[PDB]
Design a protein around this ligand. Structure first.
Ligand SMILES: [Mg+2]
Ligand SMILES: [Mg+2]
Ligand SMILES: [Mg+2]
Ligand SMILES: [Mg+2]
Ligand SMILES: [Mg+2]
Ligand SMILES: [Mg+2]
Ligand SMILES: [Mg+2]
Ligand SMILES: [Mg+2]
Ligand SMILES: [Zn+2]
Lengths: 132, 220, 338, 51, 63
RNA sequence: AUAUACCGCCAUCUUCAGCAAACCCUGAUGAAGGCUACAAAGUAAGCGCAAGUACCCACGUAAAGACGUUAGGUCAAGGUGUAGCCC
């Protein structure tokens, strides 16, 4: 039985977002990609570097906004600008949100030698696409 | 509110025949409609014996005197419920009279269920229809038997839900759980038409009398 | 390696190992959320980041990056450990449950009022008692042996209204809910004589269970099978004797008890039926007659036959007890108030 | 027991309100010790106080 | 919470008893009409039997 | 060391269509069972099938294929519970 990135059915008490609710075979059919860059296009280079950077960014944001991310990040790369669109929760204080936004922007910019912006979209609670 | 209810709801309960249902029929009318013909003596039901006049050549004859008394009571109950604005639901699985009963229900402003009675219509009503649905206040069985000669499951379900049931019980029926049994012939078109006309007339009389009494009270 | 680290959800899933071949047929560990007490911006170096773990503005001046002294950080860590251990201790400690018939038995345990109904219906007045919990197993084609709970519960208001129900569920709590919600739709009403006992002696047999219930005077107590004591407390009966012979099947016992208590002729019913006064003669009240019920309709002028010798089918146990030949080391024992 | 667990409860012949709780209001007979759970000592004191 | 025990008493008896007990706060719409004009027989469920010995149906042929 | 503690990814029936919570009913309120269309107690959210989608059509092939079975495979992808070594 296929297990890859599938949230198996339950008694109907498990809330799941749009991303979780959709199995791998729905990528490009019902769900897009969480990281957009030119590394994987034909004739382009640095796919491995982009993948490693994406993985580190995801871990770093998860650990830097603990219990705040309401859904997976979206990593967009335009030229050398890196934009992290993050959906977060309206629990942490705005002071701490701003502190962490500035902190993450600066640290990631210095670490990856590129201008990094972090766009937070706040929601009251995790958006539930369906109940599994 | 108190005086309104006292004089509207409880006023008719002080009279033996407030709606005058006895005039709607006579033993002669029932006879002419053939209300007195039952099934063969072999199909007879043990609980229908008290209402059977006899057996004319292995054919049961329903005592139309008892039918007249029972029909008086059933019509009076139906009239009082219609006056009180309760929901009256006509049930019958006789496909020969499904159309007629539905038309009578629509004309008299009440409801009908002449189709396959799905399980739980009454016992599971809140889930099936909605938590705030209003169940019928009276169920009138024009044929208490289903299409396999068994009692309509609605009879048992109505008894469960405490919905009074008027019901025409033939000599092969089981009147034990029917609140107001009316021993009669439920298979002749004449008899079924007479029953439909009687209930329609009683309900219409009750509703119009309710309106008239309300107008009389509210105009003063 | 940083890149080989996972999240708390995945780590706890793997460590606890709820799902698995072991849990398939039962062929402990506690999920501790380690992010509970942690504060964003608190690390072992004791840095005070303005705007994250300390107030941004102090007395109108923007604070600046500072570090707690070593002793201050030690104090903070000690306080954190204190909170952790207090939370763990309060988690480990448990409240003592009020046992039912026995310490480990579900029977006799209260379940609370039945859940409120949809159409503005509430049963706070009702109390629910568990009479039995079983683990019935059925062999299914695919899932080997399948475990289920059959619960018997009795609800009642203590004012006559009482019913019982069987709930089936894979989970014990769902079984309880089903049973106690179904009970309230199947309430009997039991006539109680003077609101403390039954109207007359009842000998009945439901399937292979015989129940012999005796009407008793005030203050006699409930000398009945423990389940009957529970059901009688629910119904509202204070005083009655009851002997259960034959099979002691709990469900047959409950059903037969309710059948007997529901099919009893009140004194008013007897007086109406026989067209006579029903007269009570209490030994405590001397020869004074007490008309407990009188016919609603006319009263018979016929004094009723005086049968010289009754034809009642006596019970050998009653006869033996009356004659004093029943010397049981187990009868008339001293027991807690019931 | 009920008497020994509450030191404010005193078994004294003038404490009729407490003494009544251990006499059946319908028969007037002092409940035997297992009925109420009172120890033998406190039951003897209760019986003496009731008398 | 009307009792769903259609085999125990009649709808009238169950409704009356529950109202007396206080389970039913308000009498159902039909209760007053029933109490005023009851049927000739109280509708209590009875399990039918088959006559076995010398018992015969009291129906007499109409001659 | 332990796949007979697991997460992770899967084989298998599956070249299946059923799994179903929450209710209702039947069986005397036992384990249990719940269908007849000229219908006779079942209603069912959700998952699956189906549908939708990719390739060259609406066909076909992919993909998908639930709940469960084989303590099926993997502690040697990695992580991890328990246990074990630390000159
Ligand atoms: Mg496969
Ligand atoms: Mg007929
Ligand atoms: Mg113990
Ligand atoms: Mg395995
Ligand atoms: Mg394939
Ligand atoms: Mg498909
Ligand atoms: Mg193996
Ligand atoms: Mg192996
Ligand atoms: Zn003591």
């Amino acid at each position: 039985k296929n297990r890859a990135a599938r949230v198996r059915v339950s008694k109907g008490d498990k809330p799941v977002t749009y991303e979780e609710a959709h199995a791998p075979h729905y990528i490009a059919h019902r769900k897009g990609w969480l990281s957009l860059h030119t590394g994987n296009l034909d004739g382009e280079d640095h796919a491995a570097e982009r993948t490693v950077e994406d993985v580190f960014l995801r871990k770093f944001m998860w650990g830097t906004f603990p219990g705040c991310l309401a859904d997976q990040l979206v990593l967009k790369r335009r030229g050398n600008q890196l934009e992290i669109c993050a959906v977060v929760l309206r629990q942490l204080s705005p002071h701490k949100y701003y502190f962490l936004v500035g902190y993450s922007e600066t640290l990631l910019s210095y670490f990856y030698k590129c201008p990094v912006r972090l766009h937070l979209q706040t929601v009251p609670s995790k958006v539930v696409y369906k109940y599994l | 509110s108190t005086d309104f209810n006292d004089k509207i709801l409880n006023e008719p309960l002080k009279h033996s025949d407030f709606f005058n249902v006895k005039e709607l029929f006579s033993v002669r009318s029932l006879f002419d409609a053939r209300v007195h013909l039952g099934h063969k003596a072999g199909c007879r039901h043990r609980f229908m014996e008290p209402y059977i006049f006899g057996s004319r050549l292995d054919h049961d004859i329903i005592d139309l005197e008892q039918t007249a008394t029972h029909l008086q009571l059933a019509l009076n109950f139906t009239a009082h419920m219609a006056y009180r604005k309760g929901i009256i639901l006509f049930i019958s699985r006789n496909r020969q009279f499904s159309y007629l009963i539905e038309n009578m229900a629509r004309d008299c402003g009440e409801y009908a269920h002449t189709r396959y009675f799905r399980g739980g219509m009454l016992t599971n009503a809140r889930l099936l229809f909605g938590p705030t649905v209003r169940l019928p206040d009276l169920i009138i069985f024009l044929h208490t038997l289903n299409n396999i000669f068994e009692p309509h499951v609605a009879v048992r379900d109505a008894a469960k839900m405490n919905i009074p049931t008027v019901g025409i019980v033939d000599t092969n029926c089981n009147p034990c759980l029917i609140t107001y049994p009316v021993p009669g012939n439920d298979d002749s078109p004449l008899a079924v038409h007479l029953y439909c006309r009687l209930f329609q007339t009683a309900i219409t009389r009750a509703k119009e009398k309710r309106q008239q009494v309300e107008a009389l009270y509210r105009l003063q | 390696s940083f890149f080989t680290k996972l999240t708390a959800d995945e780590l706890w899933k793997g460590a606890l190992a709820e799902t698995g071949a072991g849990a398939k047929k039962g062929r402990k560990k506690k999920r501790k959320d380690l992010n509970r007490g942690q504060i964003i911006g608190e690390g072992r170096y004791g840095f005070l980041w303005p705007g994250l773990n300390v107030p941004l503005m102090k007395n109108g001046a923007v604070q600046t990056i500072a570090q707690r002294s070593k002793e201050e950080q030690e104090k903070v860590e000690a306080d954190m450990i204190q909170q952790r251990e207090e939370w763990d201790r309060k988690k480990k400690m448990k409240v003592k449950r009020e046992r039912g018939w026995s310490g480990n038995s579900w029977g006799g345990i209260s379940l609370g009022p039945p859940d409120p109904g949809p159409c503005g219906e509430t049963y706070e007045d009702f109390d629910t008692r568990i009479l039995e919990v079983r683990n019935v197993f059925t062999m299914t084609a695919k899932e080997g042996r399948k475990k289920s709970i059959r619960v018997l519960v009795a609800v009642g208001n203590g004012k006559g209204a009482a019913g019982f129900s069987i709930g089936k569920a894979t989970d014990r709590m769902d079984a309880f809910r089903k049973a106690k919600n179904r009970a309230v739709h199947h309430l009997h009403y039991i006539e109680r004589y003077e609101d403390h006992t039954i109207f007359h002696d009842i000998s009945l047999r439901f399937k292979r269970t015989h129940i012999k219930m005796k009407k008793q005077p005030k203050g006699y107590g409930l000398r009945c099978h423990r389940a009957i004591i529970t059901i009688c407390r629910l119904i509202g009966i204070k005083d009655m004797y009851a002997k259960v012979s034959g099979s002691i099947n709990m469900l047959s016992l409950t059903q037969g008890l309710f059948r007997g208590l529901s099919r009893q002729e009140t004194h008013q019913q007897l007086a109406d039926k026989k067209g006579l006064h029903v007269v009570e003669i209490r030994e405590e009240c001397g020869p004074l007659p007490i008309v407990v019920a009188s016919p609603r309709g006319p009263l018979r002028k016929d004094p009723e036959p005086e049968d010289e010798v009754p034809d009642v089918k006596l019970d050998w146990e009653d006869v033996k007890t009356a004659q004093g030949m029943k010397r049981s080391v187990w009868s008339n024992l001293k027991r807690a108030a019931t | 027991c009920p008497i020994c667990r509450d030191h404010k409860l005193h078994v004294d012949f003038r404490n009729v309100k407490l003494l009544e709780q251990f006499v059946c209001a319908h028969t007037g007979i002092i409940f035997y010790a297992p009925y109420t759970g009172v120890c033998v000592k406190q039951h003897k004191r209760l019986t003496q106080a009731i008398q | 919470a009307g009792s769903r025990l259609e085999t125990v008493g009649s709808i009238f008896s169950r409704t009356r008893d529950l109202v007396r007990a206080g389970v039913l706060k308000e009498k159902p719409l039909w209760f007053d009409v029933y109490d005023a004009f009851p049927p000739l027989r109280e509708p209590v469920f009875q399990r039918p039997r088959v006559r076995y010995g010398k018992a015969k149906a009291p129906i007499q042929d109409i001659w």
